[PDB]
Design a protein around this ligand. Structure first.
Ligand SMILES: CC(C)c1ncc(Cl)c(C(N)=O)n1
Ligand SMILES: CC(C)c1ncc(Cl)c(C(N)=O)n1
Ligand SMILES: CC(C)c1ncc(Cl)c(C(N)=O)n1
Lengths: 412, 412
């Protein structure tokens, strides 16, 4: 029968820091991680800024021999995973290695490496493709390399559900533990899509903010002057652990994962329905999964991408699920500060939701100068709001109409 | 407890055929779908052959306009999925659409689209990248597009576990149903990596057979003259359905899905351990999941890729798990005929495992002219073997040491 799941360790790379505490300090101070991109020339592009990871030292985590063969998204995923496992205090042994698995996902994976090898192929021929091209680029190799480095022999897989990846990865890893398939899972996501194909492709879809002259103001969820999402890089990883297994080893427990919901919009390849019907179905699934009255929800980490249709669909979904209580909870988009980490969005946002619980503070939605029509909830405009938070919900919505909701609560 | 899961519908594109019965007819006749790749200059490449889908007509499924937006791997996944749903007879309604979901995966995703958009970007700059590049290339768009087309509102996700994708997708979809998160799932995988990037990428790792003179003899699992796997394209989709749901509407049931096993080798990025210890844990996990003794297994659809180390690891793993029964079961690699469909391998091989049960016949391992050292199991060399099959296993063992096993049983 279904076991309880707690969070015992967290790890992160974000545009705000090279770990969780540094990222969280940035979140609570309303700091932007968005800046013009330096790692390539973007003068031909309609968007030239993003949330880059600043000063990432892979030689804190991996031999340079290994690092040189792995896409940045794998390096970022391993870094966050290593942080999370160290943070957990968990020791891997012959007695437990079969019971510890990994589910680290990505939306796109090793686009930079694939682009770079495509350029080699076209200009120079196939003999110039890297021998490490496949294992260094495909999405499942965060899970793969983490298992090899730590000796994890439990379920080993990867999700790819676009902007919902991190939320799905964490939810389905919790189900693995709940149902007895594992006692521990390392789960989350990683993304580094900031190459010509990534910025060019989202640019071709007119999905990105073009606020090149004021990048820190570009990401403005629910603001009347929003003009698309900001592309950001990084990773989130959590150690999920069965409750009794955590208790038995004296683990520090951050929070309990009580609820997971999924749904499909079955509406449009890229656009959310205006009424947020699929998002509402997904949150209701999650609240019923957690055995909660919707009034128990104190804080929502919104998807809040700063798109015209996405931001308003989320207000419509929260109002439909929570009714009058929609005016009592706090909802914020930390994408106002971090931008959109795509496959890693749900992973860093789950961590922010757990830290909202630990610290009893709703993070701000920065740049919310002029809330749009009907965006009249507590969106924690501009400044962090200390408040009672027993239950936190993290939402993600993705291309394909794919929705995920995670429900966390304080653990006593 | 747990609900029972049955197979009510199947769909396929393979190198042997454009549907299940044509593909299966090729399998039982020992036909090869391997040939030199056409409409492509592979002069500078060390491998110039593989398993192409021949004569695929996407306009049987999609309008020309909707097909132009989607990578070939997505088109192939949608063709298999539509076939599977049609085969099942299922009627989607407002009363059941929240209980019907999708988990169709891919190993490598939209390399063809990535190539063609790289060409545009490198030659003409980012403003010539297709607007549909991102939503038409990402792995979760088979699940996305299928959900939108059929109005499926159930769990909507995509796995990417390299060569294990199709096996994991089907197994985790079976869990969704068993644990009451869905009544119906469409599950499996699709792949189209016979672009330069796939032939070039696997070729740079020297993972491919280079038997260009005789492509049909290239894929020769357990034969002493094997020299790596053969790259192939296509898709497999199953309709998985809760047993009472299937009985209530009078569904034709092909077989029961009784077991799902996962493990991680935690050994190496691309090569299995010599003794196949991970593959052995995974098969034991699958049989435990099914409450079956190894003695009850009649038929194994091997991973059987035609790599020197992979093939010998699987023999060791089967001898370890099955002991005095390892010679009584029959084990074959249909990759001897189809080549290696990577993420779709596990999907088409689950369908071949179900059909082995329906028709009481072990498909052949063609090209097994000279079994290697210690490859003395019943490998069904050369020709199909009619026999008793109550229980059939399908194994997938991929990059990152990620393992999956499905256990199917006759239903009556
Ligand atoms: C199994 C037989 C009846 C068959 N032949 C061809 C096709 Cl394409 C299909 C299908 N499921 O769409 N089914
Ligand atoms: C499985 C059933 C519904 C089906 N689907 C597709 C085809 Cl092609 C046929 C047929 N050949 O009459 N029958
Ligand atoms: C990229 C190469 C050097 C590499 N890096 C890390 C690992 Cl863990 C392995 C492996 N054991 O398969 N190989």
């Amino acid at each position: 029968s279904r076991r309880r799941v707690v969070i015992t360790g967290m790890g992160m790379l974000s545009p705000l820091g090279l770990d969780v505490p540094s990222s969280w300090e940035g979140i609570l101070a309303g700091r932007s991680g968005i800046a013009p991109i330096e790692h390539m020339d973007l003068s031909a592009y309609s968007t030239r800024f993003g949330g880059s990871v600043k000063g990432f030292n892979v030689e804190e985590y991996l031999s340079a021999k290994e690092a040189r063969k792995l896409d940045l998204f794998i390096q970022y995923g391993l870094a966050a995973s290593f942080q999370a496992v160290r943070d957990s205090g968990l020791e891997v042994t012959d007695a437990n290695r079969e019971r510890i698995g990994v589910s680290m996902g990505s939306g796109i994976g090793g686009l930079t490496n694939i682009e770079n090898n495509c350029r080699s192929l076209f200009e120079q021929g196939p003999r110039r493709i890297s021998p490490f091209f496949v294992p260094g680029s495909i999405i499942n190799m965060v899970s793969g390399f983490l298992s090899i480095h730590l000796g994890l022999q439990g379920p080993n897989y990867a999700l790819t559900t676009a902007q919902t990846t991190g939320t799905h990865s964490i939810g389905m890893a919790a189900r693995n533990i709940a149902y007895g398939e594992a006692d521990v899972m390392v789960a989350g996501g990683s993304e580094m899509a900031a190459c010509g194909l990534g910025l060019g492709g989202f640019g071709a879809a007119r999905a990105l903010s073009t606020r090149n002259d004021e990048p820190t103001r570009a990401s403005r969820p629910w603001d009347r002057d929003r003009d698309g999402f900001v592309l950001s890089d990084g990773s989130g990883a959590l150690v999920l652990e069965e409750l009794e297994h955590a208790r038995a080893r004296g683990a520090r427990i951050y929070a309990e994962l009580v609820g997971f919901g999924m749904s499909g919009d079955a509406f449009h390849m890229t656009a959310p329905p205006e009424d947020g019907a699929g998002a509402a179905r997904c949150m209701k699934n999650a609240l019923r999964d957690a055995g909660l009255d919707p009034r128990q929800v104190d804080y929502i980490n919104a998807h809040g991408t700063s798109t015209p249709a996405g931001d308003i669909a989320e207000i419509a979904a929260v109002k439909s699920v929570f009714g009058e209580h929609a005016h009592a909870l706090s909802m914020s988009s930390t994408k106002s500060m971090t931008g959109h980490l795509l496959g890693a969005a749900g992973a860093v946002e789950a961590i922010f939701s757990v830290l909202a619980l630990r610290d009893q503070v709703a993070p701000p939605t920065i740049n919310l100068d002029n809330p749009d029509e009907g965006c009249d909830l507590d969106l924690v405009a501009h400044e962090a709001k200390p408040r009672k938070i027993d239950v936190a919900l993290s939402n993600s919505f993705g291309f394909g109409g794919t929705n995920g909701t995670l429900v966390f609560r304080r653990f006593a």
